[PDB]
């Protein structure tokens, strides 16, 4: 099975006249074996366009953001979702945003509903008087299996 | 490979309902996130709705959310688009599509197969 969500922020966060604005990728998971892939463009991958981009959490996908009160808090994903396994590598590179892409697959059984987030934020980059956009991933997990 | 064929289009009155269907050939239907797109007169083609591999999750364009609903029958290789409270602005050619990967921020990006479309005309 090659079921896969892809949040590709490459052409979503480039500086434009209306920027900065929020680009949201909503990931709805209520089936087993769903793979999630998030592409966050690297600083310097293209000249000027991502000079001040930023990804949160740095330890994604092992660490994610979750909403406590109004405050986003970093939490271990393996704590929120028991039985989660993360591939150490993705296409022979470290599974970390520092390589430009992260991936993870949720386990075949999830008992508790959970929502967590990633951030790929280019709103602090300026080029030709235009500002980049702020990207956000929301993973919505419903119990399944 | 996979071929998609839409059916169910026709003339409807404003305020009515119409259900579209889309059949897929082969034996890999559940490998595909399925979706509906449309092209209205004088416009570019736009996203309408999508339904996940198992049928468990659905996405809807803001222009139709609440009025249209999508579902699938993996035992019959069919996707359905239920339209309620049809408006003249819903007149369009409706296109079926599918792909193994789904791009929520840009739903056309992951589509690898496309039907030929079926016309829906809403008169008032």
Residue numbers in the entry:
A (entry chain A): 587 to 731
B (entry chain C): 1 to 124
Q: Which statements did the authors publish about this structure?
A:
Pfs230 is one of the leading transmission-blocking malaria vaccine candidates in development.
We determined crystal structures of anti-Pfs230 F5 and F10 nanobodies in complex with Pfs230 D1 to 1.7 and 2.1 Å resolution, respectively. As expected, the crystal structures show that F5 and F10 nanobodies bind to different sites on Pfs230 D1. On the other hand, F10 binds to one side of the Pfs230 D1 β-sandwich and forms contacts with residues of the first two β-strands and β-strand connecting loops. Here, all three CDR loops in F10 are involved in interactions with Pfs230 D1, forming an extensive buried surface area of the epitope with 691 Å2. We focused our subsequent characterization on nanobodies F5 and F10, as they were the highest affinity binders from each of the epitope bins. The affinity of F10-Fc to Pfs230 Pro-D1D2 (632.50 nM) was also weaker than its affinity to Pfs230 D1D2 (0.13 nM), and a result of a slower on-rate. Similar to the size shift assay results, F10-Fc shows weaker binding to Pfs230 Pro-D1D2 compared with F5-Fc and has an even slower on-rate.
